[PDB]
Paper text:
Lysine benzoylation (Kbz) is a recently discovered post-translational modification associated with active transcription. Here, we systematically characterize writer, eraser, and reader proteins of histone Kbz in S. cerevisiae using proteomic, biochemical, and structural approaches. The Spt-Ada-Gcn5 acetyltransferase (SAGA) complex and NAD+-dependent histone deacetylase Hst2 could function as the writer and eraser of histone Kbz, respectively. In addition, we demonstrate that a subset of YEATS domains and bromodomains serve as Kbz readers, and structural analyses reveal how YEATS and bromodomains recognize Kbz marks.
We also tried to crystallize the ternary complex composed of Hst2, benzoylated substrate, and cofactor NAD+, but the solved complex structure at 1.8 Å only showed the density of 2’-O-benzoyl-ADP-ribose, the cofactor product. We presumed that the ternary complex initially formed and reacted, producing 2’-O-benzoyl-ADP-ribose that remained bound while the debenzoylated substrate and nicotinamide dissociated. The appearance of 2’-O-benzoyl-ADP-ribose also suggests that the debenzoylation process utilizes a similar catalytic mechanism as deacetylation catalyzed by NAD+-dependent HDACs. In both structures, Hst28-294 exhibits an elongated structure containing a large Rossmann-fold domain and a small zinc-containing domain. The small domain consists of four α-helices (α3-5, α9) and three β-strands (β4-6). Both the H3 peptide and the cofactor product bind to the cleft between two domains. The superimposition of two structures by the large domains shows a 17° rotation of the small domain and the rearrangement of the α2–α3 loop involved in contacting the 2′-O-benzoyl-ADP-ribose. Such rigid body rotation might be facilitated by four glycine residues serving as hinges located at junctions between the large domain and the small domain.
Residue numbers in the entry: 8 to 294
Write the structure that this text describes.
């Protein structure tokens, strides 16, 4: 583990004008205390999940939601952005941004913790959307998140928010199954893939080699799980994950670095080796 983290730091110091793409999953938010929508519990939500959902993921299915918004509403209450403090790993992303070495973070999480830790909106790509905004599912009119958040406080929750223009259901801009993923996801990955193949030279007579770091995901859900094998072979991949998964398990590459480590301790150790503790510590205390 510490040797692998050493190599990541050494690569970054050998390529100081190169940037890093992160691809992340639910594992980077577990230390924040965010419930897993699949896990049991005591709330109204777990009662509804057990009684009303034909399968766990239907809480995110747009056809189910139209027939019965209550399960999703009760889940949004427990995932409410603002409840949870971003993790050390989330702040590592902000630190890389401050150091100008964050190319992008592709996140499968809806919790908005990357943005809340201070990562810029244009550096975040959401594979399932997020709670950042609300929209009508029928016509697309933008709503202030506050209107949806007001309903979440009612006891009980009834009279779900409806569009004042067309009367259809309003919900956070999470991409539900049955909804199209925005064009910006695929076009951003197209552009960033092209950048991963680019020859970028600055200091000396050598290119600035980038890096892709995959963290806290089991790489079992498609289409997101297709991205790691789409990283060019000539670009070094890191997997920081409690288990080896996805393309790192089947078609491991000679240059792959696999680190079985918790995301928060990986961040501490990486910052350790990079010599960025002082900058990192200021960010953690401010937020
Ligand atoms: N501290 C730690 N440090 C390092 N690694 C850690 C760690 N703690 C755990 N791990 C490793 O973290 C991995 C977690 O894997 P897991 O499959 O749970 O999450 P995922 O992101 O890959 O899921 C992809 C999608 O699956 C769907 O259910 C869910 O869809 C939605 O939310 C969704 C929402 C709205 C609309 C539509 C969909 C999700 O977005 C495991 O390998 C653990 O070993
Ligand atoms: Zn509408």
């Amino acid at each position: 583990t510490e040797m692998s983290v050493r190599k990541i730091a050494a690569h970054m110091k050998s390529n100081p004008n190169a940037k890093v793409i992160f691809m992340v999953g639910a594992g980077i938010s577990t230390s924040c205390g965010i419930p897993d929508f699949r896990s049991p519990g005591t709330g109204l939500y777990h009662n509804l999940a057990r009684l009303k959902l034909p399968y766990p993921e239907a809480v995110f299915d747009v056809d189910f939601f139209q027939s019965d918004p209550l399960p999703f509403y009760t889940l949004a209450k427990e995932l409410y952005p603002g409840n949870f403090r971003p993790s050390k790993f989330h702040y590592l992303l902000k630190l890389f941004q401050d150091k100008d070495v964050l190319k992008r973070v592709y996140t499968q999480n809806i919790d908005t913790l990357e943005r809340q830790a201070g990562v810029k909106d244009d550096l975040i790509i959401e594979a399932h959307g997020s709670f950042a905004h609300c929209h009508c599912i029928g016509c697309g009119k933008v709503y202030p998140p506050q209107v949806f958040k007001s309903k979440l406080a009612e006891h009980p929750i009834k009279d779900f928010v409806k569009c004042d223009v067309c009367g259809e259901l309003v919900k956070p801009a999470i991409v539900f199954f049955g909804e199209d993923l925005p064009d910006s996801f695929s076009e951003t990955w197209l552009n960033d893939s092209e950048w991963l193949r680019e020859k970028i030279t600055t200091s000396g007579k050598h290119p600035q080699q980038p890096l892709v770091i995959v963290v806290g995901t089991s790489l079992a859900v498609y289409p997101f799980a297709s991205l790691p094998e789409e990283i060019p072979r000539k670009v070094k991949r890191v997997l920081c994950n409690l288990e080896t998964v996805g393309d790192f398990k089947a078609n491991k590459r000679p240059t792959d670095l696999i680190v079985h480590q918790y995301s928060d301790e990986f961040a501490e150790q990486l910052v350790e080796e990079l010599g960025w503790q002082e900058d990192f510590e200021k960010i953690l205390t401010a937020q």
